[PDB]
Structure formats: structure tokens, C-alpha cells
Amino acid sequence: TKPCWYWDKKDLAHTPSQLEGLDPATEARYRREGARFIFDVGTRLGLHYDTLATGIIYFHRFYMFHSFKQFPRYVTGACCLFLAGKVEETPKKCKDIIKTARSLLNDVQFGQFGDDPKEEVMVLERILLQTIKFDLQVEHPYQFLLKYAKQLKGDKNKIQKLVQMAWTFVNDSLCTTLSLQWEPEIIAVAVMYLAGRLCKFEIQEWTSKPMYRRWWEQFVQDVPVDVLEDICHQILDLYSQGKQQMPH
Amino acid sequence: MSYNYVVTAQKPTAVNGCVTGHFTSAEDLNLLIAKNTRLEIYVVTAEGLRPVKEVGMYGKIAVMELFRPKGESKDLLFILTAKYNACILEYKQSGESIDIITRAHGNVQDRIGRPSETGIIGIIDPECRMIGLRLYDGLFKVIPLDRDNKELKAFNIRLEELHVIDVKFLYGCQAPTICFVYQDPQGRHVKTYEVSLREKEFNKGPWKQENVEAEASMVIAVPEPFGGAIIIGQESITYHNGDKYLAIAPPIIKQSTIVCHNRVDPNGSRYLLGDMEGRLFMLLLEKEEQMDGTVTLKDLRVELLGETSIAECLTYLDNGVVFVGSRLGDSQLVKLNVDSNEQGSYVVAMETFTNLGPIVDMCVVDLERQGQGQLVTCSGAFKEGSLRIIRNGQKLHIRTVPLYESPRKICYQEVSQCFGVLSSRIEVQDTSGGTTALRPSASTQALSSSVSSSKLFSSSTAPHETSFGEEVEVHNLLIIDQHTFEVLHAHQFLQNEYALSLVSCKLGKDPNTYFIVGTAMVYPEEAEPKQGRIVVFQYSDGKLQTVAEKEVKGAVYSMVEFNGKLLASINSTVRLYEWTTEKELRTECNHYNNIMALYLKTKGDFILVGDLMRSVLLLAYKPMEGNFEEIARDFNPNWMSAVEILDDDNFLGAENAFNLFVCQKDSAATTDEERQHLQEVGLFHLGEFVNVFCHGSLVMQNLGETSTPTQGSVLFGTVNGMIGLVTSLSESWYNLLLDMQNRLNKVIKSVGKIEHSFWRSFHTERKTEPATGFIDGDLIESFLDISRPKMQEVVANLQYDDGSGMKREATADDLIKVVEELTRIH
Amino acid sequence: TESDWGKRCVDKFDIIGIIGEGTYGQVYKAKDKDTGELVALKKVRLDNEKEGFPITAIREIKILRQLIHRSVVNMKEIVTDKQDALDFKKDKGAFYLVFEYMDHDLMGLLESGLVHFSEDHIKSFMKQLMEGLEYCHKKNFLHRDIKCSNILLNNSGQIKLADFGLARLYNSEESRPYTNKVITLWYRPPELLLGEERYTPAIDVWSCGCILGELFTKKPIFQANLELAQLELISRLCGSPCPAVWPDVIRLPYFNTMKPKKQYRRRLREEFSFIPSAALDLLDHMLTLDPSKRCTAEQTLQSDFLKDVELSKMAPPDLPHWQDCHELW
Numbered sequence A: 001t002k003p004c005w006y007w008d009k010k011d012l013a014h015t016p017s018q019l020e021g022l023d024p025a026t027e028a029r030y031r032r033e034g035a036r037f038i039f040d041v042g043t044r045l046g047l048h049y050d051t052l053a054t055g056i057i058y059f060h061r062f063y064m065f066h067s068f069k070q071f072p073r074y075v076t077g078a079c080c081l082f083l084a085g086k087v088e089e090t091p092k093k094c095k096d097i098i099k100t101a102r103s104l105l106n107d108v109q110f111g112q113f114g115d116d117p118k119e120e121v122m123v124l125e126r127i128l129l130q131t132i133k134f135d136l137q138v139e140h141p142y143q144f145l146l147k148y149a150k151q152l153k154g155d156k157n158k159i160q161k162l163v164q165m166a167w168t169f170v171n172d173s174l175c176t177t178l179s180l181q182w183e184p185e186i187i188a189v190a191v192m193y194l195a196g197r198l199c200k201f202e203i204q205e206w207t208s209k210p211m212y213r214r215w216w217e218q219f220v221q222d223v224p225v226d227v228l229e230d231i232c233h234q235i236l237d238l239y240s241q242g243k244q245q246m247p248h
Numbered sequence B: 001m002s003y004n005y006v007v008t009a010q011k012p013t014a015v016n017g018c019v020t021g022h023f024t025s026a027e028d029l030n031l032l033i034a035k036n037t038r039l040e041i042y043v044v045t046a047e048g049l050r051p052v053k054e055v056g057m058y059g060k061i062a063v064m065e066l067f068r069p070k071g072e073s074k075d076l077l078f079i080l081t082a083k084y085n086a087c088i089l090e091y092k093q094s095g096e097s098i099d100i101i102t103r104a105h106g107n108v109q110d111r112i113g114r115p116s117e118t119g120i121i122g123i124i125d126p127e128c129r130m131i132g133l134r135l136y137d138g139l140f141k142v143i144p145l146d147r148d149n150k151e152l153k154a155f156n157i158r159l160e161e162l163h164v165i166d167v168k169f170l171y172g173c174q175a176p177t178i179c180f181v182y183q184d185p186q187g188r189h190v191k192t193y194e195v196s197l198r199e200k201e202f203n204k205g206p207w208k209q210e211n212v213e214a215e216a217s218m219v220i221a222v223p224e225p226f227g228g229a230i231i232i233g234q235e236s237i238t239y240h241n242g243d244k245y246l247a248i249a250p251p252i253i254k255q256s257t258i259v260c261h262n263r264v265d266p267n268g269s270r271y272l273l274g275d276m277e278g279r280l281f282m283l284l285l286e287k288e289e290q291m292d293g294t295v296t297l298k299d300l301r302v303e304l305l306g307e308t309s310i311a312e313c314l315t316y317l318d319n320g321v322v323f324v325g326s327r328l329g330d331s332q333l334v335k336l337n338v339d340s341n342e343q344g345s346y347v348v349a350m351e352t353f354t355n356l357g358p359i360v361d362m363c364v365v366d367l368e369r370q371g372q373g374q375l376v377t378c379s380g381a382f383k384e385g386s387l388r389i390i391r392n393g394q395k396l397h398i399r400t401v402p403l404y405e406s407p408r409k410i411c412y413q414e415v416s417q418c419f420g421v422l423s424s425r426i427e428v429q430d431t432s433g434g435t436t437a438l439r440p441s442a443s444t445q446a447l448s449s450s451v452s453s454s455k456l457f458s459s460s461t462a463p464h465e466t467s468f469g470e471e472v473e474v475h476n477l478l479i480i481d482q483h484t485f486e487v488l489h490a491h492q493f494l495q496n497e498y499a500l501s502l503v504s505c506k507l508g509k510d511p512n513t514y515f516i517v518g519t520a521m522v523y524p525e526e527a528e529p530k531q532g533r534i535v536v537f538q539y540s541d542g543k544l545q546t547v548a549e550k551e552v553k554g555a556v557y558s559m560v561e562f563n564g565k566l567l568a569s570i571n572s573t574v575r576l577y578e579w580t581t582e583k584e585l586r587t588e589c590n591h592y593n594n595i596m597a598l599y600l601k602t603k604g605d606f607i608l609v610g611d612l613m614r615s616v617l618l619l620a621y622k623p624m625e626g627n628f629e630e631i632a633r634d635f636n637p638n639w640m641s642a643v644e645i646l647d648d649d650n651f652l653g654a655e656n657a658f659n660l661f662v663c664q665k666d667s668a669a670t671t672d673e674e675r676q677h678l679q680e681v682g683l684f685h686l687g688e689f690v691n692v693f694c695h696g697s698l699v700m701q702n703l704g705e706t707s708t709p710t711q712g713s714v715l716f717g718t719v720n721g722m723i724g725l726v727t728s729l730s731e732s733w734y735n736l737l738l739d740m741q742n743r744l745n746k747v748i749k750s751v752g753k754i755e756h757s758f759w760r761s762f763h764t765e766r767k768t769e770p771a772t773g774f775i776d777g778d779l780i781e782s783f784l785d786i787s788r789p790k791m792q793e794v795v796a797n798l799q800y801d802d803g804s805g806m807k808r809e810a811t812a813d814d815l816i817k818v819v820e821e822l823t824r825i826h
Numbered sequence C: 001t002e003s004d005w006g007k008r009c010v011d012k013f014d015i016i017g018i019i020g021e022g023t024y025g026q027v028y029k030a031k032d033k034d035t036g037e038l039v040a041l042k043k044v045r046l047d048n049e050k051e052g053f054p055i056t057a058i059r060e061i062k063i064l065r066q067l068i069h070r071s072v073v074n075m076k077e078i079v080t081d082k083q084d085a086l087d088f089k090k091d092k093g094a095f096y097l098v099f100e101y102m103d104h105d106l107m108g109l110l111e112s113g114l115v116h117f118s119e120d121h122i123k124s125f126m127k128q129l130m131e132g133l134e135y136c137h138k139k140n141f142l143h144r145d146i147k148c149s150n151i152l153l154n155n156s157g158q159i160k161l162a163d164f165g166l167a168r169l170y171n172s173e174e175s176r177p178y179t180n181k182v183i184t185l186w187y188r189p190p191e192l193l194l195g196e197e198r199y200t201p202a203i204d205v206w207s208c209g210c211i212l213g214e215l216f217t218k219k220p221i222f223q224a225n226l227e228l229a230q231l232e233l234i235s236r237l238c239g240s241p242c243p244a245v246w247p248d249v250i251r252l253p254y255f256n257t258m259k260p261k262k263q264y265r266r267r268l269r270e271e272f273s274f275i276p277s278a279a280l281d282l283l284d285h286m287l288t289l290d291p292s293k294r295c296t297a298e299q300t301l302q303s304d305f306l307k308d309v310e311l312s313k314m315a316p317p318d319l320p321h322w323q324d325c326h327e328l329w
């Protein structure tokens, strides 16, 4: 019926890119760069956050089946965004994505698009579709962050601070392989969990079961804290590696 | 685009309706006979009919009735066409000049309505206060006959009874009253209503509903002396009038369905009845007068008079003379005698009017080697079945070969100097367990005969029970001599085997010429046949010998010879068989993208497939590969009745809606899809049901015949006996003739004021499109019959194109010559 | 696995013929070489490369892999032409969308004049269609092209909805500009003739009501070639758009621009008097001018006409037969 789009962390040591001699740090960097390229290009074009995320999910999934050494990331990224725009009904012309790509990329980087940027992209659409097994519908943590937050009742301002902080954590998680490890529903809970810890809020009080200390179990069944902590650890690592700090 | 020309070679001959009255003069007795689109007016004499006038109408005559409103000297004519055109007509004669006046005209069609199953019924009040129409289910339409309603405006009355079998206005009522038979789940009933022009609704009717026979078919309005109505069924005849009820159920009428009725005595004492086996009855109303002075109906009696042709309409004229109007056989004048003849019959035939009947199939053959071509048609049904040989010589010469059974397909085999004809005859389950034929016919009167002994389906084990009295069809192949037209041989097919297709040809390297028949095993239980045979026969030395048989899993609807191979359609499949050196059929290749491949035509290595609903497909045999390839299809959905190939690019079809169309390859090779799309470039409402398309012409060719502007020749036969001809034009000749039509239509006065452009518009219940790509030759040929002032009016400002002179004005004498050449193609 | 689409080749189907033409590719009937099942292959031609893979196909793939219903067409798989070996840039091969093959299409059955519908047949037809439409409308998807060409019927009496190319998601909370003209003119709602552009799922209900009437009359109800001419015909039967019956008609951009000849009164019940009462009420509600007063799909299923219909008895329509080939002398 439907394909399996989730892998174990241990499995990422055997991605095509890794086995071709790329080390773990480089593939991680290449993934951040490609995702952020997709994010930055689409934001300049005025694209909805779902459209940006769908492209990034296509992108991440793609490099589970192909190596970064044989498929230039920025071309792949542009192709993902081009298709995502059609999937999410926020379409853009391929020429316009290329135009925006040149604006943000340097000459060395734009060399990936070769002599004919539009062609290199439009040609990849075939491989993209076959690679993502024509499974185009994608759900993202955003919708669950809002579906769950709507069921919280309490201080309007404390809950809005939780949502925005969690929303930021969602945008940041798009640069990672979490999209490939855990369903979006779990991601939404993890970012609520993380923001709750950081803001020193006790979310159970805002739920319909205020004496249910594992507040998330009413939103997402069968999630151990082990998972939410693994996700939080991975998100905050991005902040520690960079110069940026937690939004608070 | 494509350009084509369509003319009538023989007008419709089947009688669709007939009425009597005082139409031409308040003094004369008239007979108005309606053939499809044609009205014939006669005057009754002591010997026979005197023709006086014939008109064509731009419509199919669905309703025809004569009435005389107070203040008129003579009867007026009401006609309704199948496209819902209404008109009131008057005969006017000024010395030698006879013309038909359109007193009122209009279109009675509703935007929303469901066409009735039993068809348009049209009736007129005895006081000529209104015209009743039943055009749609659940609605009764009233045209009030006031002096001011020259536009024939009308209103609908909601009718609770949705499924109405028949309706008539009654005599002897205080208000306009309708009596009708209707069907609901509980059975059939008879019911009455009163019609109020003032309130524009029904009021309670004069007498209560009565439950009637399940197959009650017709309503007869009995005249003032008795009043009330008679209801005719399959087994019984009943009279209803308030409290009075009679029922006679004589066993004689149970044998054959009664289809037509007429009144003999204006007072209602005697009515004529006819049935599908051609028997003519007298229905007698036995009167009883009470001392009160009141006349009542004592009893009903049915008396058998004799045999006529199977009759669509009966009308009694005067003295002993009755006009028998026949749609399945020749129409007649017959005299009813008071004394029976020595055989017991009171009916003696006076005159016989040729009816080409339903033309199921036909072929063109030059019997006398004359380079002319004669047309041998399969005509009629049942007792009226006939072969008709037609030649040109200025009238058409027609010979009739009586068969007394239904002819189905015909093919000519020159090697044997004879025709092969498929036929079916009706037998009835009798008390022996077998069947008995109602009358001897061609298949039983053959010189030599044979019966199939095939064991292909003999395993059976499938039960099919038989009840005494049920009908069955018995199918035969008839071998008929081309000079005497004597039945030389008859081969009876298997029980429940229907013969659907017939070809005569040589196959492969086999020098023998064979008769090949494709059959279907039809059992009442089956929706679609699933068993069938292809049988190879050889007619040799007066005997028919079975050479080979091929079992198939369906009905062989159509077979055609394909370059020494046999092309057959079995249900959805189109198959190509090879004829081996072992005299057996071997399948070469198949095509399956058909719903029901009913019709097949070939040209070279190209095949035209006709489908029950998918219109036409252009197949090709690819010899390098040994298989078929789809070339192009008409994706527009149409129900086909016959197809024909005009040339390598243009294809002709006929619709079950009485419509003709032409498809062409889109001839644009840019995309594969354009080549694969057959675009309909010609559309034309013929007004006839085309059964058979046949290449050929009936015109004498001495090799001296001037080359006409028209190129090609396709003849076609229709259900009403009409024979027509389709031919192609050059772009220039089309435009000239098309522009001339538009000029002629402004000049020529239409009966009923029916726009010619409307009449020929392609018309289905769902669609209406303007005609395209077709020249109504019957309009063009009428240029020669319009008066000189009108001729010159037509040619004013008329210019020719693409000729020797790019722009050349036309004169009335130039066009007379052009049309006269166009009349020489038939 | 069964889920890895786009890799299996079209070699696995024996092509029977071209059933129909699609704008981006031609549609063929084929048999599966391994199982024998009959399918229909929609050719998706990306060779144009004007904008790549057509969005119309993307929509139909995106939606149909989500929608599971007996009355919705199922996309079995997506297969490809023999791809060029190790040269994707040279590759121009097409993609094919596999769908279950259906015996007939309603437009073809009606146009040929070869189908008859009893009340009970119409009950089974409408109950299935509305159940499918309800399933889709509850998933917040809009068909937007409900024509007789997109209703497919097996000889069993099963109905399936088919062309989802113009289909898009509907959000009640957020209205955004959608395409102003989506349904074919004969089955187009009055709101889209006046250009609402922010339409409701009730647009699909209007089309189906037009079909409902056409099943009774055997002729389409509102046949016109021009948008204004359609409004006139709809206005004659359903009544002229006016503020009393459509409180928000004045907000529609073309209300003043597009006007019927007269302010016609509603005549639907009169002109469809022949229709049974249980059905006539369904028609009046389905063909309501105001999108808000127009009934929902669920409401049609909870109607006297359809609620007590058992789909166990599907009631096959009077479809072609051998006698239909022969003519009744």
C-alpha cells in the first residue's frame, strides 16, 4: 500500500553518501546547506511554510537513495522546491526558482547547475518522483503543534510563548535527519516538551487531565520519554554547534 | 473538411398512417396517406383512387388528423412532426393551380420532459375545441383551437398517471373528455378525465376506473349512438361506459396480436380490426333498443373476414372497398363482399401498391452484363418477405420475388449463377413437442433441402423449456437462381441458431467459391450470445455441402473477405482467419477494443469497425507483423446502424436517431493523437433508418455518360423502403451548391413553415447541431420545379469560384443545366 | 514491494486500444500480463517540459492515493516506458497511471441512447455517487468537474467517480482565490457563473442534482454555450438570482453585470411534476441558488429518496443487449 519513510539513526551510517567516502559530519553539513537553501529560496519567493517543508522532506528522503557526490545538492534542492510547489498548490515557474538561486549562491556554488540551470533541474524531476515513490502527500509537525496547542487552556501569553518557541524548533529540525527518524506528530510533541522545559512551564496543568504528568500521551500514543529526549538532544546540538542560542 | 451530396433515388414507400375525410372539397371523399416525410392526397372513386396532390414536409409525420371546426366549409389537416413541429394545413385550388396553405404553425416542444414509451399520441376533440398531445410522460398538452391561436400556443396539465398506453377523446360528453389506458405496478387500468380550457386542468371524469387486460393496447372512441369506449387487448375486447360493461374473448384473436382498428359504420355498429399475421376481422356492435327509446349495447361479436397485408393503418373508404396501409409489406385496396368465396373468404384483392418494405440488406449485381447494375434487396418481414430486383428504365422497374418468410442478408455468387439469402421463418410449439409453421414459405418449398447435423453444441446439458403456442425462429440459407429466382436449395440451421452474416468468396489458394455464414446460438436466458459458428458451404451441382465449421465464443455479427482471408466480428472481438490447405480456418490475429463490433467494411489493408455505441474505428492490418493496429477512432458516442468507407480518408456512418455523419483522419501528423482522432466533418439528419450501405449505381453506363461533378457512388436502403445515394463533391462544387441552398430556402415555401435548416440539423434527444458537409440534393433538384420568377430571384448576385473564371455570375439557364446533370446520377 | 511506484515497466500490460484522449496524454485500455485484470493506462507526457510533470496528474495522484471508497476510482500503480539506460537527461519516456477498468462511461451510455433508468436504478446510482461525494467532502476535497463523462459504471451497477484533475482542498476557515470557472458549463453552479472564486463544496452538489434530473429526463437539463445563456436557463427553472433567495448575491462580482431577461419565479416542481415526490424534493434542495441553502452530500444521503436504499441490491440499469442490435419489425 504505502512506503516506509522512517529509518533508525544507526542506519544513517550506511547512506549512499557515507559509503562513497563522505564522512558523517560532511553529509550532515551538506544536508543543512541543502535544506537551508530550499528554505531561503522559497522564503524569498513568498512560499508557505508547508511548501518549504515538503521540499525539504523530499530532499532528505532523496539522499537516502542517492549520493551527494553524484547529485549536486543545490540542484536537487531547487528541484524539490519546484515539485513541492506543485504538490502543495503554491506553484512557481522553474525559471523563477533559478533566478532566486543565483541571487543567493556564489559562482562556485551556482556551477552545479551547469551550463543550463533550468534543464538540469527539470530533468531531475523524473528521478525525484521515482525516488519518492510518487508518495507526494506529506504531513509536517506544524499542523500538530497547532492541533495540540488548541487543546491547551490557560495563560494566553504563556501558551503563545510555548508555541512560538516550539515553532522555531520545528523550523530548525528541518535541517536534520529527524524528519527521517520520527513521524511529524512525535516531532510536534518533542518541541512542545523542549519549550516547556526551557520556559519552566508544566504543560499537564493546561490539559484536560491536569494530574496526568505525561501530558503528551493524550496526543500521541506509545511515545516514551526516551524518544522525546533523543529529539531534544538532537535539536539543541544544532544550537551548541553553531553560535546561535535557544530563542527564549 | 469533407464535402458530400445526398439524394433520394426512391421515395419512402411504407405507409405510416392514413385518414379519410373531406379535405380537398367539402364534397369529395379524400384519402390522405402518410409516408415518412411525404403526404399523398387521393380522391375516392368507384373504381379506385384518383391522385390529386403530393407534398413533402421538412419533418417526419408523427400525427395526422382531419377535423372541421364550426364555420369551416371543409376539413382542415393537423400534422405534428417528430421534431415537435405543429401545423394546420388547408387545401386551396384555383383552377389548375393546387397549393397547400399553412393556416397555423408552431413548435410544441418542452424544455424539460421525458419522451413517452408509446410515442407521441395526437387526438382531436369531437367538437374540435382542442387538440390533445401526449409528448412527454406525466404531462398532457392542450392546444386550444381558437381562431386567434395561429401560433399554436399551448399549456400542459399535470397527469398523475405516468405510463399511458393509449388515449382518445370520447363522444357524447358534457365536457371534453379523455379516456385512456395506463400502466402502474398493479396492472393496466382504464380511466377518464374532463378537460377544462377555462381552468386549464383536469376535473373528475364521467366514469370510474376499471381494471383491464394486462396487454390492453388500443382505445376506440365509440360514436354517439352507443357512447363510451372499446379496449382491445391480446385475448379480449371490452366495452366500457359508466355502469355498462361487456367482454368478449373469442379464441381466434388470441392467436395474433391486433394492431390496427377502423370504423366502418359512422354510428359505431361495425369496426375493422387487423392483426400481425395479416388477418382482417369485423367487430360488430349488436344493438338493443328499450321501450324508453334509448339505444344500448347488447353484445359484441368478432367475425373473421379474410387476409390482407400486415397493416399499419386500416381505412374503410366506401361501398366494399378498404385501403390496407402496410409498413412491412405491399399496401392494398381490397373489396369486402357480403357473400364468401368458395374458400370461405370475404376479402378479394383489387390493387397492389409497391412497398419496398424494410430493406434489411441489399447488393448491386449486373445480371444482364449491362454495365448498369440492378439492385436486389431483402425486403419485407414475415409473410411479406420478398426479394426485389430494381433497375432504372422515367421510372424504376421493380420485380418482386415472394418468400413468405423474413429475408435477412443477401450476397451474389457469380460462379454459381445464383444468390445466397439468409431467411428466418416463424414456427409455433405444437402438441408433438416440435414446431409447426403457420404457412409454407421459401425455406420449405426449396427444390432440394438439408438440415444441419453439427455436434458442436450437442453436449448441451443446458435446459430450455418449451410451452405450447410459443414462437420460435427457424433460420435458413436459401440458394436462389439469378434468372428464374427459383429457390434451388434451402439449408436449415441448428435449433436456436440464428444466421447473422453471409459472404461469398474464395479463400487462400483454394480455387472453390464458397458460401460462408456466421451464426449465433441465442437462448432467451442469455443477455449476449456466447456460442456461435462460422460455416463454410459449397454450392455444387444443385446441392450444398458443408466444407468446414469453426466454433466461436460469441455471435458472428459481420464477416467480410480480406485479401483471401476471412475477417469476422465475434462480439467484442474482430478476428482474421486464414484458410489452410486442409480446408480449415486458422486464426491469424485479433483486435479486442470494441464493445460490440456489429459492422465491418474493408478497403485494401484498412478496416472500418462499427460499434453499438463507440461509433466507428479505423483499423489496419499490418502484414509485416501479422496483426492489427488501431489507426483512428471517432470518440464521439453514437449508436451505429450501418457504416461505409467512402475513400482512404473519409468514412460514412448512420445513427439510430435517423442521422448521417462522415469522419475523416485528421491528417495532421504533428502529434500521434491527432492522427488517432477521427473528426466528424459531416453531419446530416436523413430522416430515415439506414440498414445497408452498398457501393454501386443503378444508372445505365454506355461509357458515353458525361463525367458528373459528383464522384463516387454509395447506395443505401432504409426501413421505410427509401433508397438514397451519397456521393462526394469538390470544395468548389460544394460551396456553389451550398450557397444555392441558402438562396433556395429563402425562395421555396415550406409546408407548415418548417425551416429547412432546422429539419436537416443533426438531432438526438440530447443534442442538436447544424448540418455540415452535406448538400441536400433533394433541395437542389427542386430548383428545376420552381417558377421562372423564382429561378431568377435565386441566381441574383450568385458567383462561382475556383473555376476557369475565378468569379463568374450565374444565370437561371446556367443553373438549370447544372441541376439537370445532377439529376442524372440516379 | 507494492508501494515502490514509478519503477515497474509498461511492458507488464498488453495494450488493447485507446479508450480516450487526455489533454496531456492519450488513455489506453490494457490487460495485466501477470494477473489478467483489465486496467486503463493514462499516459502522462512530460516531454513538453513547459512546466514538467503536469499538475493535473499530480493532483490526481496526490488525492487518489489518499481516498479509499467503493464509489471513488482507484489508482492501482504508476509505471513507465523502458527508460534510457544511465542517461536521465536524454530520457523523455512517459509515465502511466494505472486505474481499474470500468465497463462504461455515463456520457457514452446516455449519448448512445442505450441505457434506461428506473426509479430504483436512479436510487442506487445516486446513493453511490453521493456516498462517494460525502467521503471526499468529509476529507475536505472538492471534485470541481462533475460531468457525466467522469461517472463510470460497471455492468454490475457499481458507480465510481473518476477525473480528479481539477480537484483541490477546501478550508472553511481560510478562503483563498480559486479558479473562477471550474465545472463544465452544463453542470456549473450559479455561483461560479457569477464568479464567486471562493466557492464551497456545494458546487459539486449542484452538478449532481443536474445529473439527477438528467437521469429522469434522459436529456441534460441546462444546455447552453454561453455563461449568460446558462444563467437564463437556470433562472427560468430555479428562479432568477435575487436578494431574497440569495442574501449575498449582491457581493458576487457579476451580479449586476449578468442579469436574466426577467426575474423568473421558481418553477422546478411544476416542470419536474413527472418526477416522484421523494426525488423531486431532493432536486429542489440540490438545485438551490444560494450555496448556503443548498443541501450537503450527507443531507442527500439522509433523504426519503436515498436513506432507505440498500446497496446490497445495486440494481443494474437496462444496458445494451443482443436484441438492441436487432430492430423491432
Ligand SMILES: CC[C@H](CO)Nc1nc(NCc2nc3cc(Cl)c(Cl)cc3[nH]2)c2ncn(-c3cnn(C)c3)c2n1
Pocket: B593, B594, B595, B614, B633, C018, C019, C020, C021, C027, C040, C041, C042, C073, C099, C100, C101, C102, C103, C104, C105, C107, C149, C150, C152, C162, C163, C164
Ligand atoms: C478517457 C476515456 C473515457 C472517456 O469517457 N473514460 C474512461 N472510460 C473507462 N472505461 C469505460 C470505457 N470502455 C470503453 C471501450 C471503448 Cl472501445 C472506448 Cl472507445 C471507450 C471506452 N470507455 C475507464 N476506466 C478507467 N478510467 C479511468 C482512467 N483514469 N481515470 C481517472 C479513469 C476510464 N475512463
